[PDB]
C-alpha cells in the first residue's frame, strides 16, 4: 500500500526496494517567440531511481531526442519512465531485483504496473512521504552529467558517498532528505552552507563534502535553520 511514518522503518529492512521519482524526466524552459507567443524548449532530464538502504542511485539520463515528434509529452514521460525502470529491473540479476517499487507520484502507478506485468511479485506502491527528490538536479555533479549528455545514458552513483561506513541507512536517508529539502527550499543558501569552507572538499568519486561527524552535526543544524527561516518568511510566522 501507500508507505508513511508508522512503517518508516520497513523502508530499511532487507527487502530490496527502489524509489522512482519522475519529476525531472520531462524538463522545459518557457520563452517568448518572434510572433510574441510563448514556446517550450525541452532540456535533458533524468529518472531518479534510488535504493534507500544502500544509497545506490540509478540515474537514467533522458536526452531531449526522446521527445522529438511526440505528442502529450507529460503523459509520454510517465510511460518513458515506466519503460526505463522495467528495463533496469530486467537488466538486474534476480537476487538484485526489487520486491517493492515506491513511486513518488501516484500518476506513475498505472504506467509502471503495466510495464512490470512480467514481474507479478514486485509490488508497485505510492508513498505518503513528501520526498524532495525533485531537487536531485541541485546536486552539481548530477546536473553536470545530465546537461552534458548527447545520447541516452545510465550513470550509477552512491548518493550517500561513504556515510554508511559510519551511520545507519535510516540516518543517511534522513541526512539526504534534509539536504535535498534545503536545496529545494533555498538552493543558493543551501549551496553556500555546503561550500562555505574551501578547505573541506568533495572527493572526485563523491557528490557531497568530506565533513567530519561534528562538521555534519553543524551542517545539519544550518540546514534545519535554513528550512525554518524560509517557513517563517513564507507564512509571516
Amino acid at each position: 500500500g501507500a508507505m508513511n511514518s508508522s512503517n518508516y522503518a520497513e523502508l530499511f529492512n532487507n527487502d530490496i526496494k527502489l524509489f522512482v521519482d519522475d519529476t525531472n524526466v520531462y524538463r522545459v524552459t518557457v520563452h517568448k517567440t518572434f510572433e510574441g507567443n510563448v514556446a517550450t524548449k525541452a532540456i535533458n532530464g533524468c529518472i531518479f531511481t534510488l535504493n534507500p538502504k544502500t544509497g545506490h542511485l540509478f540515474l537514467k539520463i533522458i536526452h531531449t531526442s526522446v521527445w522529438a515528434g511526440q505528442k502529450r509529452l507529460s503523459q509520454l514521460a510517465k510511460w518513458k519512465t515506466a519503460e526505463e525502470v522495467s528495463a533496469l529491473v530486467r537488466s538486474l540479476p534476480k537476487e538484485e531485483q526489487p520486491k517493492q517499487i515506491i513511486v513518488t507520484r501516484k500518476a506513475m502507478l498505472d504506467p509502471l504496473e503495466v510495464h512490470m506485468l512480467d514481474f507479478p511479485n514486485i509490488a508497485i506502491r505510492p508513498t505518503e512521504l513528501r520526498l524532495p527528490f525533485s531537487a536531485a538536479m541541485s546536486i552539481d555533479k548530477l546536473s553536470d552529467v545530465v546537461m552534458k549528455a548527447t545520447e541516452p545514458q545510465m550513470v550509477l552513483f552512491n548518493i550517500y558517498d561513504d556515510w554508511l561506513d559510519r551511520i545507519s541507512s535510516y540516518t543517511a536517508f534522513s541526512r539526504l532528505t534534509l539536504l535535498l529539502r534545503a536545496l529545494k527550499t533555498n538552493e543558493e543558501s543551501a549551496k553556500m552552507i555546503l561550500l562555505s569552507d574551501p578547505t573541506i572538499t568533495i572527493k572526485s568519486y563523491h557528490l557531497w563534502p568530506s565533513f567530519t561527524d561534528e562538521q555534519w552535526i553543524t551542517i545539519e543544524s544550518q540546514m534545519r535553520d535554513l528550512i525554518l527561516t524560509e517557513y517563517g518568511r513564507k507564512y509571516n510566522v
Binding site: L76, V114, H115, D118
Partner: protein, 300 residues
C-alpha cells in the same frame, strides 16, 4: 404459450418472471405462471419475505423441456425441476389452469422490453458460465462469486464470466504497453472478439446476462463484469460501426429498465463518466447518454 407450475407456495415470497414481479403469501393456493411467451430465454427469481438475504433464481428456455417449481423444506428454497413425463405434465397444466390458481404472464403487445434485454442471451452460453450439466436450467444467486473474483473459493458454485483485466498480459502486447493501455482496440478486437467470443453476438450475450444477474439478484461480480465489458468497447478507438450502434440500443434498454431507487448500487460513476464524456466513443452512445442525463443526472 408455456407454463411453469408450482407444487405449492409454503413460504411468503416475491416471485420474479423476466422483468415482472408479484407477491405470494405463506401457504397461499398458488400453482405457478401460465401464458409465458416462447422463443427467448426466461428467468424465474425469488426473494423470501421472511429473509430478503439470498435472492436466487433459474434461467431456462421452455423449448428445452417442461419445468416446474417445488419448495424443498430441507434446503429452504423453491427448486426448479424438469418433468420428463410429458403426459403427466400436460395433465397437471391442463387442470391447475382449469383451477385458475396460476398467475398470467402479463405481456403488453407494444412492450418488447424483454426481447431488447435478452436479444443476445442464449441458454447454451448461460450453461457455459453457470456449470451444472445435469440440469437444462441454470441457478444463480446474490452471493455467487465470479471466476475472476476467485483469482483475487468453491469453483462448482461460481460464475464463469470471461476474465477481463485491463492490467494483464492478455490485455497488453509486450512493446505496446502505452498504446494498448490507452487504446484497448487490440484487447477488444483480436483477443476478445476474434480470440474468445468469436463474434459480437456472444460478447453482447454475456454483457446482457451480466446486467440481468446484477439487476435481478444484486450479484456484485455480475455488475463488475457488465461495467468491464462496456468500458472495454468505450476505451477502444477502433470498434466496428454496427457494434457501437447496437451497444447504444443495448445500454438504453438496460438504463430504461433499471429501478430508479437502485442507481447508487448498480451504476459505477467512474465507468459511466468515462464512457459518456471522456472515452473514444463519448459521441457514439447518443440514446444512452440522453436517458442517463435525464434519468440519473446525480451520477454525472
Amino acid at each position: 404459450m408455456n407454463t411453469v407450475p408450482f407444487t405449492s407456495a409454503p413460504i411468503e415470497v416475491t416471485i420474479g418472471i423476466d422483468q415482472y414481479s408479484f407477491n405470494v403469501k405463506e401457504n397461499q393456493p398458488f400453482h405457478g405462471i401460465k401464458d409465458i411467451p416462447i422463443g427467448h430465454v426466461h428467468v424465474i427469481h425469488f426473494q423470501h419475505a421472511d429473509n430478503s438475504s439470498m435472492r436466487y433464481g433459474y434461467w431456462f428456455d421452455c423449448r428445452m423441456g417442461n419445468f416446474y417449481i417445488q419448495y424443498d423444506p430441507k434446503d429452504g428454497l423453491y427448486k426448479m425441476m424438469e418433468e420428463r413425463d410429458g403426459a403427466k405434465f400436460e395433465n397437471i397444466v391442463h387442470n391447475f389452469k382449469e383451477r385458475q390458481m396460476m398467475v398470467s404472464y402479463p405481456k403488453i403487445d407494444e412492450d418488447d422490453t424483454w426481447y431488447n434485454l435478452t436479444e443476445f442471451v442464449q441458454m447454451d452460453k448461460i450453461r457455459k458460465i453457470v456449470r451444472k450439466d445435469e440440469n437444462q436450467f441454470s441457478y444463480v444467486d446474490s452471493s455467487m462469486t465470479t471466476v475472476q473474483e476467485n483469482e483475487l473459493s468453491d469453483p462448482a458454485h461460481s460464475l464463469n464470466y470471461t476474465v477481463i483485466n485491463f492490467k494483464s498480459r492478455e490485455a497488453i502486447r509486450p512493446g505496446h504497453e502505452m498504446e494498448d493501455f490507452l487504446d484497448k482496440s487490440y484487447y477488444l478486437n483480436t483477443v476478445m472478439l476474434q480470440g474468445i467470443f468469436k463474434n459480437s453476438s456472444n460478447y453482447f450475450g454475456e454483457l446482457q446476462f451480466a446486467f440481468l444477474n446484477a439487476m435481478f439478484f444484486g450479484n456484485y461480480g455480475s455488475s463488475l463484469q457488465w461495467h468491464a465489458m462496456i468500458e472495454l468497447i468505450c476505451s477502444s478507438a477502433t470498434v466496428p460501426k454496427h457494434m457501437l450502434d447496437k451497444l447504444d440500443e443495448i445500454l438504453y434498454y438496460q438504463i430504461k429498465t433499471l429501478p430508479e431507487q437502485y442507481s447508487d448500487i448498480l451504476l459505477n460513476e467512474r465507468v459511466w463518466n468515462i464512457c459518456l464524456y471522456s472515452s473514444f466513443q463519448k459521441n457514439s452512445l447518443h440514446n444512452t447518454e440522453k436517458i442517463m442525463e435525464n434519468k440519473y443526472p446525480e451520477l454525472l
